[PDB]
Amino acid sequence: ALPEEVNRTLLQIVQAFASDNQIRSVAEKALSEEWITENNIEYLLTFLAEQAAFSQDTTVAALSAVLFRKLALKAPITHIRKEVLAQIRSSLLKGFLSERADSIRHKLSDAIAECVQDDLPAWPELLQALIESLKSGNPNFRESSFRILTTVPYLITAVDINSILPIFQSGFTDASDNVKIAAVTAFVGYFKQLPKSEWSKLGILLPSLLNSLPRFLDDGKDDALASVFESLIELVELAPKLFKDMFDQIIQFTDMVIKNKDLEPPARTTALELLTVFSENAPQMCKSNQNYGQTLVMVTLIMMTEVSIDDDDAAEWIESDDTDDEEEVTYDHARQALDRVALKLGGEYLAAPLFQYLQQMITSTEWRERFAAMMALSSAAEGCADVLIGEIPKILDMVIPLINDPHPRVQYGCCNVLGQISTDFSPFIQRTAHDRILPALISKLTSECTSRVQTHAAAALVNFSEFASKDILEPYLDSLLTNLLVLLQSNKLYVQEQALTTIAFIAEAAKNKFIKYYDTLMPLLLNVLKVNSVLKGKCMECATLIGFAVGKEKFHEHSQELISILVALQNSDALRSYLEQSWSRICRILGDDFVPLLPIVIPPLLITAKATQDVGLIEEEEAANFQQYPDWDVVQVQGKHIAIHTSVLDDKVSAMELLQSYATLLRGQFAVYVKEVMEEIALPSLDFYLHDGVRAAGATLIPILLSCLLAAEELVLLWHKASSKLIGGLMSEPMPEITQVYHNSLVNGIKVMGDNCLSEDQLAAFTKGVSANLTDTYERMQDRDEYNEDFTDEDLLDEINKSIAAVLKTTNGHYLKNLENIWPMINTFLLEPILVIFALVVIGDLIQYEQTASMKNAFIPKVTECLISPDARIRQAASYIIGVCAQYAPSTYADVCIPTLDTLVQIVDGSKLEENRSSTENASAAIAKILYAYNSNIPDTYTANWFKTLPTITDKEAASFNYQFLSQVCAQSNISAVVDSVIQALNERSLTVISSVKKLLGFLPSSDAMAIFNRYPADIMEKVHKWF
Amino acid sequence: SAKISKPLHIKT
């Protein structure tokens, strides 16, 4: 179909691709600069389709198929002439139906798929080819057809339903494993790609798929089973309820696989994953079935015993360092599975089945089962905390006896649990089980025990210490410390390292109680450092945490020598980060005396925090293996593939956070760096579209930088620059969580910069940003079923409220004008609770600045509704609005405020209860506002009602009004309720009303005055003396 | 990690 000249030019080029730099680079330029142009592109696509279809050379065929796939997207296929699309399609199809190597048929299939499209003409020859190939006796034809149905799931819609059903059923049951896997993959891909409204049309095939599964175990084809479990895992995340009717059968099947422990791990790990993922996607369904929980606990307990296989003494485990053995695959998987399901389902549902088994495993003569027991509890404790936090003596009764098990791995197991639960049941467990936990861990520290066990116990003392007060640790310190010094003398590096960190963290919790241990510890530490990088880092960490615990005066006995060692250490990669945190901690200890060390510490942080977005424009194939590295990720942004060096950008964050924390501590003393950090780090960081941590860390740096310069023209320039990039980010930023940080960052910027810190264009550009943010939140939220059982959004709206309020205040009202343009938006929200709360909160801010009449009619009907809402947050925002009406718009509002006033006397009356103490306090303030505005114009029972709502202890601005009103009830024997109403507010720290009160007590004898405080305990009488 | 903690989740 091509001129013969064109053919050997193109042939030469494509053949040059395999090869030398010269021949191959000349071809590369030729292709990209000469052949992919409006004028040659169709010739090029025609050629490549011909080669892939007909070439007898493997390499040329393959390459052309790949190239065609790549270039056919870019063209794109849509702007190709009809006569040439047709010809390309026809040859691609003839190639597919001819004799090709498997991998070329795969590449042809991928090329064919690029030629099937919404706006492209119908290709009914494809449809026909796929149906016939599916019946071919050649697996490669069957497999390749399902591969095309995977790339282009719309084709499945286009075949008659009575053909496509038997196609998949024959597919699931095919003699070829490869065809099975491709059938499964195409079947699940359909649900991946199509709207839910199309799902019911293949959904009916699920039981045929599930019914095909036992055959994989009959044939002993477990690797193939694993891949099918993988597709099934993706189907659970898309349509868990499709599994409802056969739920027991899948549970029992996964059970059966995992028990067959001659199977290789992949079938067993993916089976477990399939089990696990129901708890994440259909928690009601798992909970409505006692079998799920029982099987899930049983099979993770089986897998947790699979340790030290063929090594009963644990010699290998005893002899190694305190890391995980990465050969213990099923055991690792079982621990994260139990944890994951516990976290989803809660203890109400799993503790019973869990405990049924543990009671029994604790007593086995198989050590593996006694260990399993401890590790299973360790996995489940957090998710089951709601129940287990109450059964804490019972748990210690089981665990603590094992601390002395003959087998050192069971001992390590028990250390593990005491550690895990010191975290998960904190702070309650530190208060109530210190007397059992500490002696138990401390007994393992002795050099009688194995290195692994001493180390594990020392690690568990970090978990305990984290949430133990200095007073609880105090009687245990000398004993803790004398033991850990012995650990410090071990011959094993990892015991020393753990010893050091354990002492550091105990010292952190001990605080000033650690002062007496400083003189024994500090020289031991100095000696280690003067002499094993990690040891030195953990040692400097230990020293500076001891520093922070004992305070600056005591830290001064060794600070200069310690600082000189740091210097030597820094200027000489796990080390880097211990060094930087230690400098940062010295800054917290020394305060302003750190200032002379800034030139040592800051420059290296400047370098790291200037890191650029290190991107590599990359190719499809050349990814995946790039992805292997934990330090790289690849994403698709606009069609193309990009490799981004993630670690480097994480390090840029880390450095930005340290700069941020120096700037926060040093305030005006950091000013010298502000310009440079702002222009070279904070601001360019907002443009880092490939890493959101950077963008957020850039945003939080902004207000802090400004505030440093403030405390020490530029300020105004930088603020203008920074606010404008913040504003601009609001219309472009794709991630809602980042959007939030920008609003918060504006709010904090405004708070720093003060009055009228914004210009008119900025106020207008902010409005558009606020509107686009509101528009996209609406859109995402009007998207939340047959198949299935967002604080992110709530939080973003929370902050938008703050920024609007903040902008209103800095403009001193003038932002009302701009605010008018998004009123339709606001109004839709007002009439789904999160959108409502938002809108009410906005309107309360509006009124704060009688020019709102324009909207009285548009909102009070819904606000009055909201007053009696079942949701406390709605009532709260509602009443605030009614109260603010009478405060700032007294007169354009009365026909409303006085009517509602009875509503408020009722909302006022589970009122005084934690959950809604806040809502009823606003109503209370709201009625006091009405009573003020229209003072002796009111039809007075009211005020005596209002009174019985005192005290106001939770909402501060409410309390502030109520006691202002209280200060404008008299005499009587209301007197002790009058006073206490005030003592309560003060003591609870929610709120000159004192002056008013002392006047009332003036009107009574010596003895009558005194007696009122007679009820108050010593501590609040100390305060009352200092108040009156 | 120099305290007790759980292994990282293995999903996607």
Side-chain angles (χ1 to χ4, degrees), chain A residues 1-3 5-21 23 26-28 30-31 33-37 39-73 75-78 80 84-93 95-118 120-134 136-243 245-289 291-293 295-315 317-326 328-447 449-531 533-572 574-575 577-619 621-635 639 641-712 714-736 738-778 780-781 783 785-789 792-816 818-861 863-905 907-911 913 915-963 965-971 973-988 990-997 1000-1013 1015-1021 1023-1025 1027-1028, chain B residues 1-10 12:
Chain A
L2 286 182
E5 62 271 354
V6 174
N7 285 333
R8 46 173 195 86
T9 305
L10 284 171
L11 192 45
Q12 181 282 320
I13 288 150
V14 56
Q15 294 185 228
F17 262 57
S19 176
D20 149 293
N21 255 350
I23 308 174
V26 173
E28 247 128 24
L31 184 31
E33 298 184 349
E34 301 196 74
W35 284 102
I36 291 171
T37 66
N39 271 23
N40 298 297
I41 187 62
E42 56 177 44
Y43 277 56
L44 175 61
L45 293 179
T46 301
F47 169 81
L48 295 161
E50 284 185 358
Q51 300 295 123
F54 311 119
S55 171
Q56 270 322 284
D57 177 41
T58 322
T59 359
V60 160
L63 178 301
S64 300
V66 169
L67 269 182
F68 177 97
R69 189 184 90 261
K70 297 179 180 331
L71 278 28
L73 300 139
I77 191 81
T78 309
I80 273 62
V84 178
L85 188 51
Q87 130 79 34
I88 276 162
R89 278 183 174 170
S90 37
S91 60
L92 248 20
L93 205 54
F96 175 102
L97 298 168
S98 80
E99 184 127 303
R100 307 312 258 157
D102 287 344
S103 69
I104 297 183
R105 185 161 293 94
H106 283 171
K107 279 153 186 165
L108 279 171
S109 298
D110 292 354
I112 287 172
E114 296 318 314
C115 292
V116 178
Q117 199 88 48
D118 272 320
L120 245 37
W123 188 10
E125 295 87 342
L126 175 51
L127 252 7
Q128 204 40 52
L130 286 180
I131 285 166
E132 293 177 50
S133 299
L134 290 157
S136 146
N138 179 17
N140 183 266
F141 269 79
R142 294 200 303 286
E143 188 204 24
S144 291
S145 314
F146 285 116
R147 178 191 186 98
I148 297 181
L149 300 178
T150 304
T151 315
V152 211
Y154 273 103
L155 301 186
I156 288 160
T157 300
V159 177
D160 186 75
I161 195 58
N162 282 305
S163 295
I164 192 77
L165 270 6
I167 275 168
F168 280 102
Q169 291 177 326
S170 170
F172 298 153
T173 261
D174 199 280
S176 171
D177 293 334
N178 282 339
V179 173
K180 289 189 290 197
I181 286 154
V184 184
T185 296
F187 174 75
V188 171
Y190 171 100
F191 290 91
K192 255 145 134 208
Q193 218 60 57
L194 270 88
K196 299 183 172 207
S197 65
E198 287 305 279
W199 281 13
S200 70
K201 196 172 292 216
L202 290 214
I204 60 165
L205 260 19
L206 183 67
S208 314
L209 174 43
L210 292 192
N211 282 337
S212 73
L213 299 182
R215 188 76 196 275
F216 290 99
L217 310 161
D218 294 347
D219 289 306
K221 235 78 176 140
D222 38 283
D223 50 350
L225 216 203
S227 299
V228 168
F229 279 148
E230 271 152 358
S231 292
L232 279 172
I233 287 146
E234 299 167 67
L235 195 65
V236 170
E237 276 154 18
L238 286 158
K241 292 188 170 170
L242 217 46
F243 285 79
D245 312 310
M246 287 182 78
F247 190 30
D248 288 342
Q249 173 181 322
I250 180 97
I251 293 173
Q252 248 176 56
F253 188 71
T254 58
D255 186 87
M256 189 165 82
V257 175
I258 288 150
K259 279 165 165 134
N260 169 349
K261 84 161 89 192
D262 288 343
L263 247 29
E264 288 278 272
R268 309 180 61 234
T269 57
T270 54
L272 199 215
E273 181 67 10
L274 214 218
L275 259 187
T276 296
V277 124
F278 292 101
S279 73
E280 277 143 5
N281 299 282
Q284 301 114 252
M285 195 180 68
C286 294
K287 275 173 167 166
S288 95
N289 190 212
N291 198 22
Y292 172 82
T295 305
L296 185 281
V297 160
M298 186 191 198
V299 292
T300 52
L301 288 172
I302 283 173
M303 296 166 74
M304 273 187 234
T305 75
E306 303 178 9
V307 295
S308 284
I309 76 175
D310 292 353
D311 177 14
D312 263 72
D313 294 335
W317 175 88
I318 281 174
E319 223 48 67
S320 53
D321 66 3
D322 57 339
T323 68
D324 297 323
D325 178 338
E326 76 177 330
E328 294 169 348
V329 179
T330 51
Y331 157 77
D332 175 69
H333 274 253
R335 296 172 69 192
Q336 65 84 42
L338 218 194
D339 177 32
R340 280 158 70 182
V341 171
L343 283 173
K344 291 306 188 183
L345 308 184
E348 271 301 277
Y349 183 88
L350 306 167
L354 180 35
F355 275 93
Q356 292 176 337
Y357 275 101
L358 300 183
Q359 313 282 342
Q360 206 158 312
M361 294 177 67
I362 49 174
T363 74
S364 154
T365 72
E366 228 264 271
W367 74 258
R368 283 170 253 232
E369 265 189 41
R370 296 195 308 278
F371 166 76
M374 300 298 89
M375 298 323 249
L377 187 32
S378 284
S379 310
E382 177 181 0
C384 296
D386 54 345
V387 165
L388 295 188
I389 210 157
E391 260 105 29
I392 190 139
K394 184 200 185 186
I395 289 158
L396 303 177
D397 300 337
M398 315 181 194
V399 145
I400 295 193
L402 299 191
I403 191 106
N404 295 111
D405 189 282
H407 198 288
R409 218 166 161 168
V410 182
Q411 280 172 18
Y412 169 107
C414 180
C415 285
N416 197 93
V417 212
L418 296 170
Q420 192 62 57
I421 70 186
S422 302
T423 299
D424 296 321
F425 307 161
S426 66
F428 314 98
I429 189 168
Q430 279 77 10
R431 293 173 194 159
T432 73
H434 61 80
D435 39 288
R436 315 190 45 191
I437 303 185
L438 290 171
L441 300 165
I442 287 167
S443 75
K444 298 335 286 182
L445 297 172
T446 65
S447 55
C449 302
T450 195
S451 292
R452 291 299 300 266
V453 164
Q454 321 180 264
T455 305
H456 219 53
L461 288 157
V462 182
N463 300 76
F464 191 92
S465 281
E466 194 179 348
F467 290 107
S469 71
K470 61 190 194 173
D471 293 329
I472 275 148
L473 286 188
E474 230 220 81
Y476 295 98
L477 298 169
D478 194 59
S479 177
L480 283 157
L481 296 179
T482 75
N483 281 282
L484 294 147
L485 311 176
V486 180
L487 267 81
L488 210 35
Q489 312 171 252
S490 172
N491 288 328
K492 255 139 175 180
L493 193 55
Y494 76 86
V495 175
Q496 288 169 233
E497 280 175 8
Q498 180 70 54
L500 286 176
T501 298
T502 296
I503 284 162
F505 280 104
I506 284 159
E508 174 173 75
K511 300 167 196 309
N512 66 299
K513 296 307 174 158
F514 199 80
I515 294 189
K516 81 156 111 171
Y517 296 103
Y518 175 107
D519 295 323
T520 68
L521 243 320
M522 201 63 37
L524 291 51
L525 249 23
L526 287 172
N527 290 167
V528 171
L529 284 165
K530 295 187 222 186
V531 139
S533 265
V534 191
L535 220 225
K536 277 176 182 224
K538 283 193 145 78
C539 195
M540 189 58 75
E541 183 180 65
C542 189
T544 61
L545 287 157
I546 285 153
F548 188 77
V550 305
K552 169 183 201 170
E553 294 307 316
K554 185 68 151 150
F555 176 63
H556 218 85
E557 300 169 23
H558 292 106
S559 55
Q560 299 308 302
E561 178 175 14
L562 215 40
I563 284 167
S564 71
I565 287 161
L566 252 182
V567 176
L569 248 20
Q570 163 170 313
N571 285 283
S572 67
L575 195 53
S577 161
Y578 288 109
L579 300 186
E580 289 168 352
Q581 290 293 315
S582 282
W583 280 122
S584 164
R585 202 152 29 229
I586 294 176
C587 181
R588 303 210 270 297
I589 296 165
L590 258 31
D592 300 348
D593 289 324
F594 195 79
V595 169
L597 303 157
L598 292 167
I600 292 156
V601 151
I602 307 293
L605 296 179
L606 292 175
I607 301 322
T608 305
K610 295 167 163 165
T612 44
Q613 219 168 213
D614 169 45
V615 54
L617 303 154
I618 188 175
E619 214 126 359
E621 312 93 54
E622 290 295 314
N625 69 343
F626 244 88
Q627 264 283 165
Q628 282 164 10
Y629 299 111
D631 292 336
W632 288 86
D633 298 86
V634 295
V635 295
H641 273 275
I642 321 174
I644 59 129
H645 206 345
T646 309
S647 69
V648 159
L649 272 27
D650 292 353
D651 290 351
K652 175 179 173 92
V653 177
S654 292
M656 287 160 75
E657 285 161 346
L658 288 155
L659 286 171
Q660 191 173 126
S661 82
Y662 289 115
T664 291
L665 304 161
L666 270 12
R667 288 137 312 162
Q669 332 254 225
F670 201 72
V672 59
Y673 295 107
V674 159
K675 159 171 267 277
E676 163 175 29
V677 178
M678 183 71 86
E679 294 172 355
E680 303 191 57
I681 294 154
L683 267 10
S685 286
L686 308 189
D687 301 335
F688 276 57
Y689 62 92
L690 271 3
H691 192 285
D692 54 274
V694 181
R695 273 182 259 133
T700 54
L701 226 14
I702 287 147
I704 292 144
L705 298 188
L706 280 346
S707 112
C708 291
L709 196 42
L710 213 217
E714 220 165 276
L715 175 58
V716 141
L717 210 71
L718 294 157
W719 168 230
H720 193 262
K721 251 177 265 199
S723 48
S724 282
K725 205 151 190 186
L726 280 180
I727 282 151
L730 306 176
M731 216 136 83
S732 63
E733 178 48 37
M735 307 257 294
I738 304 315
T739 314
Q740 167 176 356
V741 170
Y742 298 169
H743 281 279
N744 180 259
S745 179
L746 281 154
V747 170
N748 292 321
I750 298 170
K751 149 76 76 67
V752 159
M753 295 306 293
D755 258 327
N756 249 251
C757 56
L758 298 161
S759 63
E760 191 69 52
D761 38 298
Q762 286 174 301
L763 298 162
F766 172 69
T767 305
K768 306 200 183 187
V770 167
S771 172
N773 295 162
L774 292 180
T775 279
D776 307 347
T777 305
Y778 191 62
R780 291 188 312 258
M781 266 227 85
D783 277 68
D785 165 276
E786 188 177 349
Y787 294 109
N788 301 93
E789 277 189 17
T792 45
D793 286 319
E794 202 203 72
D795 293 336
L796 179 63
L797 304 156
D798 281 358
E799 272 291 341
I800 294 186
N801 272 321
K802 310 276 174 71
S803 45
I804 282 160
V807 169
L808 274 155
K809 177 160 171 147
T810 197
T811 53
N812 190 19
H814 285 43
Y815 188 66
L816 297 150
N818 310 255
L819 189 26
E820 273 175 23
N821 305 340
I822 52 156
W823 229 106
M825 265 315 304
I826 287 156
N827 199 226
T828 326
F829 276 52
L830 211 222
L831 34 87
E832 176 59 29
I834 291 89
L835 313 185
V836 183
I837 281 167
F838 177 84
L840 296 176
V841 176
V842 167
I843 299 173
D845 288 328
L846 285 169
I847 304 151
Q848 206 150 163
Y849 313 89
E850 302 177 342
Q851 136 188 207
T852 34
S854 31
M855 8 153 121
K856 162 169 166 162
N857 281 342
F859 65 73
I860 343 229
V863 170
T864 42
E865 229 131 62
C866 287
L867 282 168
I868 54 145
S869 159
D871 192 346
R873 309 170 294 160
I874 305 180
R875 306 202 306 271
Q876 158 132 26
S879 23
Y880 182 73
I881 283 178
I882 280 311
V884 88
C885 285
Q887 225 203 310
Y888 298 104
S891 53
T892 138
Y893 282 100
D895 56 340
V896 201
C897 292
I898 294 136
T900 52
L901 176 59
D902 296 308
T903 333
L904 305 184
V905 178
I907 310 171
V908 129
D909 285 309
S911 257
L913 209 80
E915 10 282 29
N916 6 64
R917 172 93 61 167
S918 183
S919 295
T920 77
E921 260 164 26
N922 275 95
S924 155
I927 102 176
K929 286 169 165 190
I930 294 158
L931 293 148
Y932 187 54
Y934 325 121
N935 33 103
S936 37
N937 284 238
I938 192 86
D940 222 36
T941 229
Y942 290 137
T943 102
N945 289 300
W946 165 77
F947 196 72
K948 290 265 122 62
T949 64
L950 299 223
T952 319
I953 59 178
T954 300
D955 186 286
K956 297 178 181 185
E957 29 288 301
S960 183
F961 196 96
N962 284 346
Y963 297 86
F965 190 29
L966 184 66
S967 195
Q968 345 231 42
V969 176
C970 283
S973 53
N974 269 291
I975 193 124
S976 181
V978 172
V979 170
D980 179 65
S981 97
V982 176
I983 301 306
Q984 294 307 315
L986 291 172
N987 193 78
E988 228 74 86
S990 54
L991 115 163
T992 83
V993 196
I994 285 173
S995 316
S996 337
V997 160
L1000 231 48
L1001 289 149
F1003 278 113
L1004 279 155
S1006 252
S1007 57
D1008 279 337
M1010 327 278 94
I1012 295 197
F1013 308 89
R1015 65 212 263 190
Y1016 297 116
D1019 81 280
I1020 95 91
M1021 284 294 287
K1023 299 175 183 135
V1024 157
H1025 271 72
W1027 284 330
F1028 296 87
Chain B
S1 205
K3 69 172 172 174
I4 308 311
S5 58
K6 308 195 227 134
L8 239 306
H9 296 173
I10 311 195
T12 64

